[PDB]
Design a protein around this ligand. Structure first.
Ligand SMILES: O=c1ccn([C@H]2C[C@H](O)[C@@H](COP(=O)(O)OP(=O)(O)OP(=O)(O)O)O2)c(=O)[nH]1
Ligand SMILES: [Mg+2]
Length: 216
């Protein structure tokens, strides 16, 4: 097992409403967990618990290894698009090119005369929301880690682009890696090894897409 939550309850504020209530799941090494649910349901908070920024009041948690986290709020720091993606990690041409292809960024980059040395975050180019989201995803996927926490990374993307990048990046490029993906899209739940649907902190559903279809 790579990540376990067992009867986890947690609070951001002592004496408040629990942000997570009796949460249970298990991910084996290399599997994909999809975490779904409405705004405020506790999805980012669950990721924060895995990253150690929120401790459980009840229950047990297991996880080891390096984490790579992709925030639901895309961000850019001053520097080239290549510097933003490798972001202090050692550079390898093949690895970098595999990530930008999987994130459909080779298309965007090929159109600039400076190519991967185009400068971001310094008042020149103003990136679209979709461009910033794919750069942020690429940054998180480039990092070598044992666990990838991808919090709603497909912001500003149309449904076909989202589908293509989910398949090329999350399913193929990252096929060997333990992944938690916060997402609500049907294909992503169908392809995940397990699904956790949160509602107001509680487990609305936990199991597989097939199990949910069998309840209809
Ligand atoms: O530092 C924090 C983060 C969250 N909350 C609260 C706000 C909210 O009532 C609850 C759930 O927030 P979360 O960000 O975990 O929800 P989400 O499922 O990620 O919502 P969204 O889909 O809008 O990202 O946790 C806090 O009090 N403090
Ligand atoms: Mg969130």
């Amino acid at each position: 097992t790579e990540v376990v939550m067992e009867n986890v309850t947690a609070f951001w504020e002592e004496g408040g409403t629990p942000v997570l209530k009796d949460i249970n799941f298990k991910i084996e090494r290399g599997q994909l967990l999809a975490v779904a649910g409405s705004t405020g349901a506790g999805k980012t908070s669950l990721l924060m618990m895995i990253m150690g920024e929120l401790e459980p009041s009840e229950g047990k948690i297991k996880h080891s290894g390096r984490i790579s986290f992709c925030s639901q709020f895309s961000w850019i720091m001053p520097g080239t698009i290549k510097e933003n993606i490798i972001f202090g990690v050692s550079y390898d041409e093949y690895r970098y090119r595999s990530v930008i292809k999987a994130c459909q960024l080779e298309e965007d980059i090929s159109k600039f005369a400076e190519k991967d040395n185009i400068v971001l975050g310094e008042g020149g180019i103003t990136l679209s929301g979709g461009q910033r989201a794919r750069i942020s995803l690429a940054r998180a996927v480039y990092k070598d880690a044992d666990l990838y926490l991808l919090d709603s990374p497909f912001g500003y993307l149309d449904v076909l682009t989202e589908k293509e990048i989910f398949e090329s990046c999350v399913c193929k490029l990252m096929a060997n890696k333990t992944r938690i993906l916060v997402t609500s899209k049907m294909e992503h739940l169908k392809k995940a090894d397990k699904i956790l649907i949160l509602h107001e902190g509680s487990s609305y559903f936990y199991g597989t897409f097939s199990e949910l279809q069998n309840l209809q």
